[PDB]
Design a protein around this ligand. Structure first.
Ligand SMILES: Nc1nc2c(ncn2[C@@H]2O[C@H](COP(=O)(O)OP(=O)(O)O)[C@@H](O)[C@H]2O)c(=O)[nH]1
Ligand SMILES: Nc1nc2c(ncn2[C@@H]2O[C@H](COP(=O)(O)O)[C@@H](O)[C@H]2O)c(=O)[nH]1
Ligand SMILES: [Mg+2]
Ligand SMILES: [Mg+2]
Ligand SMILES: [Mg+2]
Ligand SMILES: [Mg+2]
Ligand SMILES: [Mg+2]
Length: 403
């Protein structure tokens, strides 16, 4: 049979709203994710007797190509499908911190390139998720020649760009057409990255919940669960951990943050239990925390490390920054203005997003006073910078958080 193992790689699914991201994930995994960020897993195998791409399978069966032989197991993979709506760009940025590679979904029956087609694309480039496949979705609704016409636009768009040789794979997610070619492309272009498991364990938090059913007996109350993805190193059951920045405290008009210390009581990927958690997949860390602390994604944006790790938790940061020429996600083309002092910016760092006031601007560096602190677990940490333009937070640049 096939091993029951954790997913070993995270594939983002991004692109403009309604282009078919969620349907594409369902086409691949059989799972419909109504949750955003959405999440789903599948095993991937190959029938070694049969010809490709239909040799690739997402279940342990080669019936569809003749064999009663079991297909060779290749790996378990995970999809993170980001929301496409322009107002949800911050959520796309959080999710991108979790991605090892991405699929950019482009609807074949809409004029390319749409605003979030562009914004998601450049966001991926900035944060370095460059193992990209471009998927031309909804080909079922246009003629071959119309699809090809857009194909050459996509090629024109990526030319002269880091994505110049990114593959473009046409499919119908809704009617499940040419999905085998996408799976073959996933194996070819989105390899599982090398993981240095000696690095200090860091997990980025995107969810937290109280898993207790209603009216549950108080002696019966399970501890809080925290969901996210392990970004480096690995965690084990019964490891002493902390959540950073942690818990916000009133005290009584002056707000501060206190690290939350706890212990890993259980580890879970999907519905399977494990003893360890490594990079790849969305992990649910069980803890001894009061469920009231982890209710309703309360800890989104936090990180988790071992209890004794040294981690700066900063209310002021220095960023070595670069601005985009123009505001890519806007409908109307707009040039980005230089950072000005005393202007509030939105910073995405890991899975967190937080507002700050610019206290210093230089050609290559800004300093900002944060409304809430961020945990900075490493020296070269990419941040994405957004400005409120048009009543809406728009990506305008990026930087390195300098410590
Ligand atoms: N005709 C056709 N419709 C599709 C395809 N994929 C998605 N859709 C439809 O497009 C709409 C938006 O799909 P959805 O996956 O929710 O888009 P998302 O916002 O990017 O996640 C839904 O009505 C889908 O049924 C496709 O391959 N062909
Ligand atoms: N590690 C761990 N995860 C749990 C436990 N109970 C629920 N989860 C996880 O928490 C999430 C929400 O579960 P639900 O509240 O829908 O039952 C799921 O990802 C599930 O796997 C648990 O006892 N230990
Ligand atoms: Mg969706
Ligand atoms: Mg499957
Ligand atoms: Mg197949
Ligand atoms: Mg990555
Ligand atoms: Mg067609």
């Amino acid at each position: 049979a096939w091993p029951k193992v954790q997913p070993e790689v995270n594939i983002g699914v991004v692109g403009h709203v309604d282009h078919g991201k969620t349907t594409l994930v369902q086409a691949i995994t059989g799972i419909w994710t109504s949750k955003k960020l959405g999440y789903a897993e599948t095993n991937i195998g190959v029938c070694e007797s049969c010809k490709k791409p239909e040799a690739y399978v997402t279940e342990p069966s080669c019936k569809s190509c003749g064999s009663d032989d079991e297909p060779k197991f290749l790996r378990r993979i995970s999809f993170i499908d980001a929301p496409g709506h322009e107002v949800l760009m911050a959520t796309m940025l959080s999710g991108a911190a979790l991605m090892d590679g991405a699929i950019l979904v482009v609807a074949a029956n809409e004029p390319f390139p749409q605003p979030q087609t562009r914004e998601h694309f450049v966001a991926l480039g900035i944060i370095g998720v460059k193992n990209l496949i471009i998927v031309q979705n909804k080909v079922d609704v246009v003629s071959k020649e119309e699809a090809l016409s857009q194909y050459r636009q996509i090629k024109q768009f990526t030319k002269g760009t880091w994505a110049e040789n990114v593959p473009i794979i046409p499919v119908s997610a809704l009617h499940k057409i040419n999905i085998d070619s996408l799976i073959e492309g996933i194996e070819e272009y989105i390899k599982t990255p090398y993981r240095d498991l000696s690095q200090k364990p860091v997990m980025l938090v995107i969810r937290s919940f109280d898993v207790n059913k209603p009216g549950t007996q108080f002696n019966e109350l399970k501890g809080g669960v925290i969901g996210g993805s392990i970004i480096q190193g690995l965690f084990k059951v019964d490891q002493e951990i902390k959540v950073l920045p942690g818990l916000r405290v009133e005290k009584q008009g002056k707000v501060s943050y206190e690290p939350i210390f706890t212990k890993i009581s259980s580890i879970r990927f999907g519905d399977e239990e494990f003893k360890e958690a490594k990079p790849g997949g969305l992990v649910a860390i069980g803890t001894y925390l009061d469920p009231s602390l982890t209710k309703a994604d309360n800890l989104l944006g936090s990180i988790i490390t071992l209890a004794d790790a040294e981690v700066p938790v900063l209310w002021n940061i220095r960023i070595k920054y670069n601005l985009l020429e123009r505001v890519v996600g806007a409908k109307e083309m707009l040039k980005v203005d230089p950072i000005r002092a005393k202007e509030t910016l939105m910073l995405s760092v890991g899975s967190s997003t937080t507002l700050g006031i610019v206290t210093s601007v230089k050609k290559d560096e800004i300093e900002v006073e944060l409304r809430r602190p961020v945990a900075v677990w490493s020296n070269n940490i990419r941040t994405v910078i957004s400005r409120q333009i048009a009543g809406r937070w728009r990506m305008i640049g990026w930087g390195l958080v300098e410590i």
